[PDB]
Enzyme design. Structure first.
Site, short mmCIF file in Angstrom:
data_model
loop_
_atom_site.label_atom_id
_atom_site.label_comp_id
_atom_site.label_asym_id
_atom_site.label_seq_id
_atom_site.Cartn_x
_atom_site.Cartn_y
_atom_site.Cartn_z
N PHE A 59 25.77 -24.61 7.94
CA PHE A 59 25.88 -23.22 7.50
C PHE A 59 27.19 -22.62 8.01
CE2 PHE A 59 21.68 -22.01 5.85
CZ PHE A 59 20.88 -23.00 6.35
N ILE A 83 14.69 -20.55 10.38
CA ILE A 83 14.55 -21.88 10.99
C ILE A 83 15.11 -21.90 12.40
CG2 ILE A 83 14.58 -23.19 8.87
CD1 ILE A 83 17.49 -23.65 9.09
N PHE A 107 23.02 -25.11 -1.24
CA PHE A 107 21.65 -24.83 -1.63
C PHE A 107 21.33 -23.34 -1.61
CE2 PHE A 107 21.64 -26.28 2.80
CZ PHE A 107 21.17 -25.19 3.46
N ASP A 108 22.11 -22.52 -0.89
CA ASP A 108 21.90 -21.07 -0.91
C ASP A 108 23.12 -20.38 -0.33
OD1 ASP A 108 20.09 -19.10 -1.82
OD2 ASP A 108 19.75 -18.50 0.26
N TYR A 154 26.11 -15.78 4.59
CA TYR A 154 26.01 -17.20 4.89
C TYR A 154 26.12 -18.05 3.64
CZ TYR A 154 21.35 -17.06 2.97
OH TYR A 154 20.26 -16.92 2.15
N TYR A 199 14.37 -27.90 8.26
CA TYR A 199 13.15 -28.05 7.46
C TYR A 199 12.42 -29.37 7.71
CZ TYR A 199 14.42 -23.72 5.32
OH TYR A 199 14.69 -22.36 5.21
#
Ligand SMILES: CC(C)C[C@H](NC(=O)[C@@H]1CCCCN1S(=O)(=O)Cc1ccc(F)cc1)C(=O)NCc1cccnc1
Ligand code: NA
Ligand code: NA
Ligand code: NA
Ligand code: NA
Length: 162
Positions: free
Chosen positions: A130, A87, A69-70, A59, A113
């Protein structure tokens, strides 16, 4: 109105515009929860994971402005999650994906979040984007069948306006 209220009102406004613009894509599907997805690839798997199945995934997560962010892809190796560890937008999507499926997920802040944000990089009231590929499900997957999933997704598209 205080500054914090005005700032979060802004965040909610532009976040909602982002969600609306992505839901209006012709290949986008909006679910009643508010989760939106686009299919990047359709997998050959025949079962979706159960809420506690271990899912091996690749991902990349991005904010509305494209900031990453990741990313497991940047780390060069997949990551394994259960739906009940992630989440809400991911919990729902994973249970609608089969092995080989690759989806672009557009997750509103209330399924991500939320009001606090997370990780220092995701501010309050952030929708998330994502690109997620479901590589494998440990021991095959004990959730919905491919036919059960496709009916949900077919019917979801039908009642978009409702
Ligand atoms: C280790 C991992 C299992 C944890 C898990 N992760 C995720 O669910 C998401 C989606 C799946 C890929 C990983 N990320 S992520 O990339 O967005 C994290 C991130 C955030 C901010 C940032 F700056 C960098 C990375 C988590 O947070 N669960 C707790 C929780 C559950 C329900 C509501 N709220 C929180
Ligand atoms: Na983006
Ligand atoms: Na699917
Ligand atoms: Na969020
Ligand atoms: Na947030």
């Amino acid at each position: 109105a205080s500054h914090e209220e005005r700032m979060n009102n802004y965040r909610k406004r532009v976040g909602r515009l982002f969600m609306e613009q992505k839901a209006a894509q012709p290949d986008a599907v909006k679910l009643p929860s508010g989760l939106v997805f686009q299919r990047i690839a359709r997998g050959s798997g025949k079962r979706a994971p159960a809420i506690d199945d271990k899912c091996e995934v690749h991902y990349t997560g991005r904010l509305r402005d494209g900031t990453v962010f990741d990313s497991s892809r940047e780390r060069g190796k997949p990551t394994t999650f259960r739906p009940n560890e992630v989440i809400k937008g991911w919990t729902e999507a994973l249970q609608l994906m089969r092995e080989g499926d690759r989806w672009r997920l557009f997750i509103p802040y209330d399924l991500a979040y939320g009001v606090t944000g997370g990780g220092g990089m995701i501010p309050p009231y952030s929708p998330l984007e994502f690109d997620v590929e479901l590589i494998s499900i440990k021991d095959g997957g004990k959730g919905r069948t491919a036919e059960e999933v496709d009916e949900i997704l077919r019917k979801a598209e039908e009642d978009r306006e409702d």
